[PDB]
Amino acid sequence: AKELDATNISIDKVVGAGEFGEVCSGRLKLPSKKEISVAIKTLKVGYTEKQRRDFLGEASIMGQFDHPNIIRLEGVVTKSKPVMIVTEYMENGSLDSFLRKHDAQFTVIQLVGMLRGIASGMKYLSDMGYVHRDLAARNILINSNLVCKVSDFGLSRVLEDKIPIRWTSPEAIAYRKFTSASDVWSYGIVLWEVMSYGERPYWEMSNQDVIKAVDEGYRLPPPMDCPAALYQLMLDCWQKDRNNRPKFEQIVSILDKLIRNPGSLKIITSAAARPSNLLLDQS
Numbered sequence: 479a480k481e482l483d484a485t486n487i488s489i490d491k492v493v494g495a496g497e498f499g500e501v502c503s504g505r506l507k508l509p510s511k512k513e514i515s516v517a518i519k520t521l522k523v524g525y526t527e528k529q530r531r532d533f534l535g536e537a538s539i540m541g542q543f544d545h546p547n548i549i550r551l552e553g554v555v556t557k558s559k560p561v562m563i564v565t566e567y568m569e570n571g572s573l574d575s576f577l578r579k580h581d582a583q584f585t586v587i588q589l590v591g592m593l594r595g596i597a598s599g600m601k602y603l604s605d606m607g608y609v610h611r612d613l614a615a616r617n618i619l620i621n622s623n624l625v626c627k628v629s630d631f632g633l634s635r636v637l638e639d640k641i642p643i644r645w646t647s648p649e650a651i652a653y654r655k656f657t658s659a660s661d662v663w664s665y666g667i668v669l670w671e672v673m674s675y676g677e678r679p680y681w682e683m684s685n686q687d688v689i690k691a692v693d694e695g696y697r698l699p700p701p702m703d704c705p706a707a708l709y710q711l712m713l714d715c716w717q718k719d720r721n722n723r724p725k726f727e728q729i730v731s732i733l734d735k736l737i738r739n740p741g742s743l744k745i746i747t748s749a750a751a752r753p754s755n756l757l758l759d760q761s
């Protein structure tokens with residue numbers, strides 16, 4: 479992480495709050511004198527050593543990536559207090575809360591563009607040997623041009639040697655087997671979230687029932703007017719055998735084909751006469 483000079487940082491307004499303190503919008507003056515919009519996260523006063531380590535540790539992971547669909551770290555302030563993390567500004571906030579404001583208001587192709595961005599960021603993250611472990615719409619940020627970027631590296635780990643039940647693969651729930659294929663499972667959940675405009679995966683089902691139902695082969699049902707190609711992709715991401723799930727590169731390719739031939743999205747799926755809220759996948 480670049481150590482920033484605080485004279486180049488100007489804080490505007492508080493836009494949200496996190497575990498470690500506040501999130502503000504503001505401006506960063508770059509060494510070239512160009513000024514850019516940024517988000518500024520500050521570590522609360524009277525922080526513990528653990529809080530500082532976790533706060534800056536997440537920035538250290540973020541900083542190892544330089545990709546259009548991973549949130550960009552502009553730098554940190556550590557040599558004065560409060561400690562700060564400065565990232566690119568994402569005008570439309572978190573993807574799940576953004577989509578809930580706009581139910582049924584985007585085209586299928588717009589939604590597919592969002593999904594393609596997320597998949598591309600994940601392809602790079604997995605190429606770099608990281609497993610995110612908390613890939614969920616609430617951890618995707620979306621900018622003024624609807625570009626979606628992976629964020630929140632608080633649970634991320636290098637592949638070597640509370641976790642969000644609704645987004646976690648059955649094998650990771652069962653015995654902590656986290657791999658890039660468990661992030662592909664999570665991607666399938668994000669795909670359902672996007673096509674559902676921010677509906678909660680598995681609604682408010684008891685966690686024990688989410689675990690049992692999924693292990694028994696039950697899957698989230700097709701969102702309203704969901705293209706067949708996209709529901710099939712969800713089912714593929716949710717294969718019981720992790721070896722049968724697509725790789726992120728394959729997901730990017732699948733979505734690129736749908737963008738290239740939007741007519742393919744005209745084939746729709748539904749399941750109105752099904753016996754239960756979750757759908758048993760035969761496959």
Ligand SMILES: Nc1ncnc2c1ncn2[C@@H]1O[C@H](COP(=O)(O)OP(=O)(O)NP(=O)(O)O)[C@@H](O)[C@H]1O
Pocket residue numbers: 493494495496497501516517565566567568569570571572575616617619630
């Ligand atoms: N780079 C950014 N640009 C604009 N807003 C941001 C940025 N980073 C965080 N925020 C906003 O700050 C608020 C608090 O951040 P955060 O608590 O990280 O998001 P919430 O996470 O949506 N999802 P989660 O905390 O995982 O349940 C949210 O409304 C974010 O969308």
Ligand SMILES: [Mg+2]
Pocket residue numbers: 616617629630
């Ligand atoms: Mg977050």
